Structure formats: structure tokens, C-alpha cells
C-alpha positions as a LaTeX table, in Angstrom:
\begin{tabular}{lrrr}
\hline
Residue & $x$ (\AA) & $y$ (\AA) & $z$ (\AA) \\
\hline
Glu1 & $-0.65$ & $-131.68$ & $-70.69$ \\
Ile2 & $-2.13$ & $-134.90$ & $-72.18$ \\
Phe3 & $-4.52$ & $-133.18$ & $-74.58$ \\
Ser4 & $-6.00$ & $-136.39$ & $-76.01$ \\
Gln5 & $-9.77$ & $-136.23$ & $-76.71$ \\
Glu6 & $-10.38$ & $-140.00$ & $-76.28$ \\
Leu7 & $-9.26$ & $-139.75$ & $-72.69$ \\
Thr8 & $-11.27$ & $-136.58$ & $-72.11$ \\
Gln9 & $-14.41$ & $-138.35$ & $-73.32$ \\
Arg10 & $-13.88$ & $-141.29$ & $-70.99$ \\
Glu11 & $-13.47$ & $-138.85$ & $-68.12$ \\
Ala12 & $-16.70$ & $-136.96$ & $-68.85$ \\
Asn13 & $-18.21$ & $-140.38$ & $-69.24$ \\
Val14 & $-17.21$ & $-141.66$ & $-65.81$ \\
Lys15 & $-18.33$ & $-138.36$ & $-64.33$ \\
Lys16 & $-21.92$ & $-138.61$ & $-65.56$ \\
Val17 & $-22.12$ & $-141.99$ & $-63.83$ \\
His18 & $-20.59$ & $-140.73$ & $-60.59$ \\
Glu19 & $-22.89$ & $-137.67$ & $-60.56$ \\
Asn20 & $-25.68$ & $-140.23$ & $-60.65$ \\
Leu21 & $-24.33$ & $-142.33$ & $-57.79$ \\
Glu22 & $-24.16$ & $-139.16$ & $-55.71$ \\
Glu23 & $-27.75$ & $-138.25$ & $-56.50$ \\
Leu24 & $-29.09$ & $-141.69$ & $-55.64$ \\
Gln25 & $-27.15$ & $-141.79$ & $-52.39$ \\
Lys26 & $-28.26$ & $-138.31$ & $-51.34$ \\
Lys27 & $-31.79$ & $-139.53$ & $-51.98$ \\
Leu28 & $-31.63$ & $-142.69$ & $-49.90$ \\
Asp29 & $-29.71$ & $-140.34$ & $-47.65$ \\
His30 & $-32.94$ & $-138.42$ & $-47.21$ \\
Thr31 & $-35.79$ & $-140.93$ & $-47.24$ \\
Ser32 & $-37.35$ & $-141.73$ & $-43.88$ \\
Phe33 & $-37.56$ & $-144.93$ & $-41.81$ \\
Ala34 & $-39.94$ & $-146.94$ & $-44.14$ \\
His35 & $-38.53$ & $-149.19$ & $-46.62$ \\
Asp36 & $-33.50$ & $-150.74$ & $-50.15$ \\
Arg37 & $-34.73$ & $-149.75$ & $-53.59$ \\
Leu38 & $-32.12$ & $-147.04$ & $-53.84$ \\
Glu39 & $-29.47$ & $-148.97$ & $-51.94$ \\
Ala40 & $-30.09$ & $-151.59$ & $-54.59$ \\
Gln41 & $-29.63$ & $-148.98$ & $-57.32$ \\
Ile42 & $-26.64$ & $-147.33$ & $-55.64$ \\
Ala43 & $-24.78$ & $-150.61$ & $-55.31$ \\
Gln44 & $-25.35$ & $-151.00$ & $-59.03$ \\
Lys45 & $-23.76$ & $-147.76$ & $-60.27$ \\
Glu46 & $-20.90$ & $-148.50$ & $-57.90$ \\
Gln47 & $-19.90$ & $-151.53$ & $-59.92$ \\
Glu48 & $-20.49$ & $-149.71$ & $-63.21$ \\
Gln49 & $-18.26$ & $-146.78$ & $-62.28$ \\
Lys50 & $-15.74$ & $-149.19$ & $-60.80$ \\
Ala51 & $-15.63$ & $-150.71$ & $-64.28$ \\
Lys52 & $-15.44$ & $-147.47$ & $-66.22$ \\
Leu53 & $-12.51$ & $-146.22$ & $-64.10$ \\
Ala54 & $-10.64$ & $-149.53$ & $-64.57$ \\
Glu55 & $-10.60$ & $-148.99$ & $-68.33$ \\
Tyr56 & $-9.84$ & $-145.31$ & $-68.03$ \\
Asp57 & $-6.85$ & $-146.09$ & $-65.81$ \\
Gln58 & $-5.32$ & $-148.49$ & $-68.37$ \\
Lys59 & $-5.80$ & $-145.90$ & $-71.10$ \\
Val60 & $-3.99$ & $-143.34$ & $-68.91$ \\
Gln61 & $-1.17$ & $-145.80$ & $-68.26$ \\
Asn62 & $-0.53$ & $-146.51$ & $-71.93$ \\
Glu63 & $-0.52$ & $-142.78$ & $-72.58$ \\
Phe64 & 2.10 & $-142.49$ & $-69.85$ \\
Asp65 & 4.40 & $-145.16$ & $-71.31$ \\
Ala66 & 4.05 & $-143.48$ & $-74.70$ \\
Arg67 & 5.32 & $-140.29$ & $-73.05$ \\
Glu68 & 8.20 & $-141.80$ & $-71.09$ \\
Arg69 & 9.64 & $-143.61$ & $-74.11$ \\
Ala70 & 9.34 & $-140.43$ & $-76.14$ \\
Glu71 & 11.23 & $-138.76$ & $-73.33$ \\
Arg72 & 14.06 & $-141.28$ & $-73.49$ \\
Glu73 & 14.40 & $-140.77$ & $-77.25$ \\
Arg74 & 14.88 & $-137.06$ & $-76.53$ \\
Glu75 & 17.59 & $-137.54$ & $-73.88$ \\
Ala76 & 19.69 & $-139.72$ & $-76.17$ \\
Ala77 & 19.35 & $-137.26$ & $-79.03$ \\
Arg78 & 20.89 & $-134.74$ & $-76.62$ \\
Gly79 & 23.89 & $-136.52$ & $-75.16$ \\
Asp80 & 25.52 & $-139.82$ & $-74.17$ \\
Ala81 & 22.56 & $-142.19$ & $-73.91$ \\
Ala82 & 24.73 & $-144.81$ & $-72.25$ \\
Ala83 & 25.59 & $-142.21$ & $-69.67$ \\
Glu84 & 21.96 & $-141.45$ & $-68.93$ \\
Lys85 & 21.17 & $-145.15$ & $-68.49$ \\
Gln86 & 23.78 & $-145.26$ & $-65.73$ \\
Arg87 & 22.36 & $-142.24$ & $-63.95$ \\
Leu88 & 18.93 & $-143.86$ & $-63.79$ \\
Ala89 & 20.84 & $-146.95$ & $-62.77$ \\
Ser90 & 22.70 & $-145.47$ & $-59.83$ \\
Leu91 & 19.45 & $-143.90$ & $-58.66$ \\
Leu92 & 16.99 & $-146.77$ & $-58.88$ \\
Lys93 & 19.62 & $-148.68$ & $-56.90$ \\
Asp94 & 19.19 & $-146.50$ & $-53.83$ \\
Leu95 & 15.82 & $-148.17$ & $-53.62$ \\
Glu96 & 17.73 & $-151.31$ & $-52.62$ \\
Lys97 & 13.36 & $-150.35$ & $-47.78$ \\
Pro98 & 10.68 & $-152.58$ & $-49.45$ \\
Met99 & 10.68 & $-155.70$ & $-51.65$ \\
Leu100 & 10.19 & $-153.89$ & $-54.94$ \\
Ser101 & 9.59 & $-155.85$ & $-58.13$ \\
Glu102 & 10.75 & $-155.15$ & $-61.66$ \\
Glu103 & 7.24 & $-153.86$ & $-62.33$ \\
Asp104 & 7.17 & $-151.76$ & $-59.16$ \\
Thr105 & 10.53 & $-150.25$ & $-60.06$ \\
Asn106 & 9.27 & $-148.99$ & $-63.40$ \\
Ile107 & 6.20 & $-147.31$ & $-61.87$ \\
Leu108 & 8.61 & $-145.55$ & $-59.54$ \\
Arg109 & 11.10 & $-144.64$ & $-62.24$ \\
Gln110 & 8.28 & $-143.27$ & $-64.35$ \\
Leu111 & 6.72 & $-141.27$ & $-61.50$ \\
Phe112 & 9.86 & $-139.93$ & $-59.86$ \\
Leu113 & 12.60 & $-140.41$ & $-62.46$ \\
Ser114 & 10.69 & $-139.58$ & $-65.62$ \\
Ser115 & 8.64 & $-136.52$ & $-66.41$ \\
Ala116 & 5.85 & $-138.46$ & $-68.12$ \\
Val117 & 3.35 & $-138.22$ & $-65.28$ \\
Ser118 & 4.61 & $-135.01$ & $-63.76$ \\
Gly119 & 2.45 & $-132.25$ & $-65.18$ \\
Ser120 & 0.35 & $-134.38$ & $-67.54$ \\
Gly121 & $-2.77$ & $-133.51$ & $-65.56$ \\
Lys122 & $-3.53$ & $-137.24$ & $-65.17$ \\
Phe123 & $-2.60$ & $-139.96$ & $-62.68$ \\
Ser124 & $-3.12$ & $-143.72$ & $-62.40$ \\
Phe125 & $-4.64$ & $-145.24$ & $-59.27$ \\
Gln126 & $-3.47$ & $-148.65$ & $-60.31$ \\
Asp127 & 0.20 & $-147.64$ & $-60.38$ \\
Leu128 & $-0.12$ & $-145.94$ & $-57.02$ \\
Lys129 & $-2.05$ & $-148.73$ & $-55.34$ \\
Gln130 & 0.44 & $-151.34$ & $-56.50$ \\
Val131 & 3.40 & $-149.40$ & $-55.04$ \\
Leu132 & 1.56 & $-148.28$ & $-51.91$ \\
Ala133 & 0.82 & $-151.92$ & $-51.24$ \\
Lys134 & 4.50 & $-152.71$ & $-50.85$ \\
Tyr135 & 5.45 & $-149.62$ & $-48.86$ \\
Ala136 & 2.78 & $-149.99$ & $-46.19$ \\
Asp137 & 4.75 & $-152.89$ & $-44.71$ \\
Thr138 & 7.89 & $-150.75$ & $-44.61$ \\
Ile139 & 5.79 & $-148.71$ & $-42.19$ \\
Pro140 & 5.60 & $-149.54$ & $-38.46$ \\
Glu141 & 2.04 & $-150.60$ & $-37.67$ \\
Gly142 & 0.49 & $-147.35$ & $-36.50$ \\
Pro143 & $-1.85$ & $-144.45$ & $-37.36$ \\
Leu144 & 0.11 & $-143.36$ & $-40.40$ \\
Lys145 & $-0.06$ & $-146.94$ & $-41.71$ \\
Lys146 & $-3.82$ & $-147.04$ & $-41.41$ \\
Leu147 & $-3.88$ & $-143.92$ & $-43.62$ \\
Phe148 & $-1.89$ & $-145.79$ & $-46.29$ \\
Val149 & $-4.03$ & $-148.89$ & $-46.00$ \\
Met150 & $-7.12$ & $-146.76$ & $-46.35$ \\
Val151 & $-6.07$ & $-145.45$ & $-49.76$ \\
Glu152 & $-5.00$ & $-148.90$ & $-50.93$ \\
Asn153 & $-8.06$ & $-150.86$ & $-49.69$ \\
Asp154 & $-9.88$ & $-148.64$ & $-52.08$ \\
Thr155 & $-13.43$ & $-149.50$ & $-50.99$ \\
Lys156 & $-16.43$ & $-148.82$ & $-53.13$ \\
Gly157 & $-14.19$ & $-146.94$ & $-55.59$ \\
Arg158 & $-13.92$ & $-143.59$ & $-53.79$ \\
Met159 & $-10.11$ & $-143.67$ & $-53.70$ \\
Ser160 & $-10.09$ & $-144.95$ & $-57.24$ \\
Tyr161 & $-12.47$ & $-142.20$ & $-58.40$ \\
Ile162 & $-10.76$ & $-139.27$ & $-56.65$ \\
Thr163 & $-7.31$ & $-140.26$ & $-57.93$ \\
Leu164 & $-8.34$ & $-140.81$ & $-61.58$ \\
Val165 & $-10.82$ & $-137.91$ & $-61.89$ \\
Ala166 & $-11.43$ & $-135.83$ & $-58.79$ \\
Val167 & $-7.83$ & $-134.71$ & $-58.23$ \\
Ala168 & $-5.60$ & $-136.22$ & $-60.98$ \\
Asn169 & $-4.13$ & $-132.86$ & $-61.99$ \\
Asp170 & $-3.15$ & $-132.10$ & $-58.41$ \\
Leu171 & $-1.57$ & $-135.50$ & $-57.83$ \\
Ala172 & 0.35 & $-135.13$ & $-61.07$ \\
Ala173 & 1.73 & $-131.83$ & $-59.78$ \\
Leu174 & 3.11 & $-133.20$ & $-56.51$ \\
Val175 & 5.32 & $-135.52$ & $-58.48$ \\
Ala176 & 8.61 & $-134.64$ & $-60.17$ \\
Asp177 & 11.81 & $-136.02$ & $-61.72$ \\
Phe178 & 14.41 & $-136.38$ & $-59.00$ \\
Arg179 & 17.11 & $-135.67$ & $-61.62$ \\
Lys180 & 15.45 & $-132.35$ & $-62.37$ \\
Ile181 & 15.42 & $-131.30$ & $-58.71$ \\
Asp182 & 18.93 & $-132.62$ & $-58.31$ \\
Thr183 & 20.98 & $-130.06$ & $-60.16$ \\
Asn184 & 24.71 & $-130.70$ & $-59.60$ \\
Ser185 & 23.76 & $-134.34$ & $-60.18$ \\
Asn186 & 24.95 & $-135.43$ & $-56.65$ \\
Gly187 & 22.14 & $-137.92$ & $-56.15$ \\
Thr188 & 21.02 & $-136.28$ & $-52.92$ \\
Leu189 & 19.02 & $-133.08$ & $-52.66$ \\
Ser190 & 20.11 & $-130.48$ & $-50.10$ \\
Arg191 & 18.05 & $-128.39$ & $-47.66$ \\
Lys192 & 18.45 & $-125.49$ & $-50.04$ \\
Glu193 & 17.24 & $-127.57$ & $-52.99$ \\
Phe194 & 14.55 & $-129.24$ & $-50.86$ \\
Arg195 & 13.09 & $-125.92$ & $-49.74$ \\
Glu196 & 13.18 & $-124.51$ & $-53.29$ \\
His197 & 11.26 & $-127.44$ & $-54.74$ \\
Phe198 & 8.66 & $-127.64$ & $-52.00$ \\
Val199 & 7.90 & $-123.95$ & $-52.20$ \\
Arg200 & 6.79 & $-124.56$ & $-55.78$ \\
Leu201 & 4.42 & $-127.30$ & $-54.58$ \\
Gly202 & 2.90 & $-124.98$ & $-52.00$ \\
Phe203 & 4.86 & $-125.57$ & $-48.81$ \\
Asp204 & 5.97 & $-122.02$ & $-48.16$ \\
Lys205 & 6.42 & $-122.43$ & $-44.40$ \\
Lys206 & 9.88 & $-123.21$ & $-42.98$ \\
Ser207 & 8.19 & $-124.86$ & $-40.04$ \\
Val208 & 6.34 & $-127.30$ & $-42.30$ \\
Gln209 & 9.25 & $-127.59$ & $-44.69$ \\
Asp210 & 11.46 & $-128.69$ & $-41.80$ \\
Ala211 & 8.75 & $-131.09$ & $-40.76$ \\
Leu212 & 8.88 & $-132.73$ & $-44.17$ \\
Phe213 & 12.66 & $-132.81$ & $-44.38$ \\
Arg214 & 12.69 & $-134.39$ & $-40.94$ \\
Tyr215 & 10.28 & $-137.00$ & $-42.23$ \\
Ala216 & 12.17 & $-137.89$ & $-45.40$ \\
Asp217 & 15.67 & $-138.15$ & $-43.96$ \\
Glu218 & 15.43 & $-141.43$ & $-42.08$ \\
Asp219 & 19.21 & $-141.79$ & $-42.41$ \\
Glu220 & 19.58 & $-138.71$ & $-40.19$ \\
Ser221 & 22.19 & $-137.03$ & $-42.41$ \\
Asp222 & 20.46 & $-133.73$ & $-43.17$ \\
Asp223 & 20.40 & $-134.75$ & $-46.85$ \\
Val224 & 17.64 & $-136.17$ & $-49.05$ \\
Gly225 & 18.45 & $-139.03$ & $-51.40$ \\
Phe226 & 16.30 & $-140.37$ & $-54.23$ \\
Ser227 & 15.12 & $-143.22$ & $-51.98$ \\
Glu228 & 14.04 & $-140.95$ & $-49.11$ \\
Tyr229 & 12.62 & $-138.58$ & $-51.71$ \\
Val230 & 10.40 & $-141.37$ & $-53.04$ \\
His231 & 9.20 & $-142.13$ & $-49.53$ \\
Leu232 & 8.20 & $-138.53$ & $-48.86$ \\
Gly233 & 6.54 & $-138.22$ & $-52.26$ \\
Leu234 & 4.38 & $-141.32$ & $-51.81$ \\
Cys235 & 3.39 & $-139.94$ & $-48.44$ \\
Leu236 & 2.27 & $-136.65$ & $-49.95$ \\
Leu237 & 0.19 & $-138.36$ & $-52.64$ \\
Val238 & $-1.72$ & $-140.29$ & $-49.96$ \\
Leu239 & $-2.42$ & $-137.28$ & $-47.75$ \\
Arg240 & $-3.52$ & $-135.27$ & $-50.79$ \\
Ile241 & $-5.83$ & $-138.10$ & $-51.76$ \\
Leu242 & $-7.26$ & $-138.38$ & $-48.26$ \\
Tyr243 & $-7.58$ & $-134.60$ & $-48.06$ \\
Ala244 & $-10.01$ & $-134.68$ & $-50.97$ \\
Phe245 & $-11.53$ & $-137.84$ & $-49.56$ \\
Ala246 & $-12.78$ & $-135.74$ & $-46.65$ \\
Asp247 & $-14.21$ & $-132.74$ & $-48.46$ \\
Phe248 & $-17.94$ & $-133.54$ & $-48.09$ \\
Asp249 & $-18.89$ & $-130.24$ & $-49.69$ \\
Lys250 & $-16.70$ & $-128.59$ & $-52.30$ \\
Ser251 & $-15.54$ & $-126.22$ & $-49.55$ \\
Gly252 & $-12.02$ & $-126.79$ & $-50.85$ \\
Gln253 & $-10.71$ & $-126.69$ & $-47.29$ \\
Leu254 & $-11.18$ & $-129.18$ & $-44.49$ \\
Ser255 & $-13.02$ & $-128.60$ & $-41.25$ \\
Lys256 & $-12.23$ & $-129.86$ & $-37.77$ \\
Glu257 & $-15.28$ & $-132.09$ & $-38.12$ \\
Glu258 & $-14.09$ & $-133.30$ & $-41.52$ \\
Val259 & $-10.56$ & $-134.25$ & $-40.41$ \\
Gln260 & $-12.15$ & $-136.08$ & $-37.48$ \\
Lys261 & $-14.09$ & $-138.57$ & $-39.66$ \\
Val262 & $-11.17$ & $-139.61$ & $-41.89$ \\
Leu263 & $-9.04$ & $-140.33$ & $-38.83$ \\
Glu264 & $-11.93$ & $-142.26$ & $-37.33$ \\
Asp265 & $-12.88$ & $-143.78$ & $-40.67$ \\
Ala266 & $-9.27$ & $-144.90$ & $-41.00$ \\
His267 & $-9.55$ & $-147.03$ & $-37.82$ \\
Ile268 & $-7.18$ & $-144.94$ & $-35.72$ \\
Pro269 & $-7.03$ & $-145.43$ & $-31.91$ \\
Glu270 & $-8.36$ & $-142.56$ & $-29.77$ \\
Ser271 & $-5.28$ & $-143.48$ & $-27.77$ \\
Ala272 & $-3.33$ & $-142.17$ & $-30.74$ \\
Arg273 & $-5.18$ & $-138.92$ & $-31.23$ \\
Lys274 & $-6.14$ & $-137.45$ & $-27.84$ \\
Lys275 & $-4.49$ & $-134.01$ & $-28.22$ \\
Phe276 & $-6.01$ & $-133.86$ & $-31.70$ \\
Glu277 & $-8.10$ & $-130.81$ & $-30.90$ \\
His278 & $-5.34$ & $-128.53$ & $-29.63$ \\
Gln279 & $-3.09$ & $-129.64$ & $-32.47$ \\
Phe280 & $-5.81$ & $-128.75$ & $-34.95$ \\
Ser281 & $-5.56$ & $-125.25$ & $-33.47$ \\
Val282 & $-1.80$ & $-125.05$ & $-33.43$ \\
Val283 & $-1.86$ & $-125.88$ & $-37.12$ \\
Asp284 & $-4.74$ & $-123.57$ & $-37.92$ \\
Val285 & $-2.04$ & $-120.61$ & $-38.08$ \\
Asp286 & $-4.66$ & $-118.28$ & $-39.49$ \\
Asp287 & $-7.21$ & $-119.73$ & $-37.07$ \\
Ser288 & $-9.93$ & $-120.16$ & $-39.65$ \\
Lys289 & $-11.30$ & $-123.41$ & $-38.20$ \\
Ser290 & $-10.50$ & $-124.99$ & $-41.58$ \\
Leu291 & $-7.26$ & $-126.58$ & $-42.79$ \\
Ser292 & $-5.59$ & $-126.47$ & $-46.19$ \\
Tyr293 & $-3.59$ & $-129.28$ & $-47.75$ \\
Gln294 & $-0.36$ & $-127.78$ & $-46.37$ \\
Glu295 & $-1.87$ & $-127.63$ & $-42.86$ \\
Phe296 & $-3.53$ & $-131.01$ & $-43.11$ \\
Val297 & $-0.09$ & $-132.40$ & $-43.90$ \\
Met298 & 1.52 & $-130.57$ & $-40.97$ \\
Leu299 & $-1.26$ & $-131.91$ & $-38.74$ \\
Val300 & $-0.89$ & $-135.55$ & $-39.76$ \\
Leu301 & 2.84 & $-135.21$ & $-39.17$ \\
Leu302 & 2.59 & $-133.30$ & $-35.87$ \\
Met303 & 0.24 & $-136.00$ & $-34.61$ \\
Phe304 & 1.60 & $-139.29$ & $-35.91$ \\
His305 & 5.26 & $-138.64$ & $-36.60$ \\
\hline
\end{tabular}
């Protein structure tokens, strides 16, 4: 709900450029074996867009800070401020797992502790990328890690563009304030609470819900704590970003062929995805030869975790 016209104009701006890039490509993507005029052009627009997005991101970030602060003011005006500072304190501590910085901890507190990004309909690639960078290492070298590295490496924009424009609203909706999920204020969500929250985000299947819960609770205690919550949430932002990274057409849903590329494109060993075809089926519950974000996320899990 960031209804600020100066942002909106930068967005429409970046989009005109990108629509160009696409055209050019498609063209050189259709000319025949005789000769690098387009490629020359294409490479151009790529830098341009890469530059427009970089400014747009910053603008989005400032807007976010403006919101968070305003949110703090509100809290205080509604109760013991000092108290509230301790709550955020106890929580951010659970993060202490990666080598987070003071800067990294604020991105995280804003994304998952605030309510500044949640729902705004905007998202910053820069904030994500910075944090992803440090969590990839926390991940055992493997398929899953190549998926993280793929979003971070952000080549030729694409990741940058999809996050800032393509699917910002949807990435903003997968994020939420732990404290708002955590009603009794125990500092650890429960299966009940977990399910409830993830039904709102679209995971209406127990089977998948359990899959997620299983993934977040590394401490094997059948309870989700801020820290594990943050780990699951950063995982969902990546898969949602890759999901859209593989939608050649605007089909809205991925195809067996489409999921194949990404996995390949991500540099994942065939030795790590041999049953891939049967799994695709198992996940296809409706058997429509095309996966949805919820299914794509059950697939990734089924396969690599």
C-alpha cells in the first residue's frame, strides 16, 4: 500500500525499457544464420535497465525506512515503548546460524519483525541479495544452495528486474511480522499457528504444510522460532522469485519443461535430480502437467530436502 506516484513513475519507466529489451532479444532470437547488431543493442539496454532498477531500489528502501520508523512511533504511543524494544531484542537474538552484520540485522528486523514491507506491494532486491549472500553459506553445498546462488548472482538483471517490478507485490505478501503471527507472545509459533498463517499465503495442503514445518524446524522440536521462521521465509522468497524466473510465457503456471531449465540453468547435477520426472507427477496432484507456486515449492523440497 505504498501509493506514492514518484515510485509508480519510476516503475512504468523501467518497464518501457524492459519491454524494449524483450523486443530486441526476440528479434535477434528470430534472425537467421547471417550476421551482432541486435546483440550489441540488447547488451546496451541491459546496462540501462540495470541502472534504472538500482535507483528505483534505493527509492523503495527509503520509503520502507520511512514506514518502519512511523510504525515504531505508533507502538510507543500505544504502550510501554521500552517493553517493545526488549521484545524485538529477545527475538533478533535468536538469530545468534550465519555471521549477520548490524546492517543485515536491520533488513531482517524490517522484513520479518516490522510490517513496513509486508503488504506494501513493493520489495527491494538489494536488501534480499545482501541477506541471501550470508545465508547461502549456512547451507550445505548442494542443489538447494545453487538455487540461492542463482538469485544472488543476479546476472544480466533478470533477478533484479523480477523482484523489483515483475513480482514485488507477491514477494511483499509472503513476508510478515513474526510478532503478529506469534500471538501469546511465546517467541515460537506452533503447528496450529504455523498452519493458520501459511493457509493465508496459499499453502492449503497439510502435506505441503508439514513439508514446510519439517524444513523450518532444524532444532527438531516441533516448534517454529523466529530464527527458523526467518530461514523458511527467505527460502520461500527465493523459490517464488525463481518460479517467475521460469515463466517464459505469462502462462502463470510452470510446465515440466520450464522447471527443467531452471534446475539445469542453476547448475544442478543430474545425479541430484534423476527421479525428477516421477516427482513432477506426484506433485502435479491435479495432474495438469503444470505446477503452481505451492507445487513448485513442494517439488523443490521433495527433491532436494
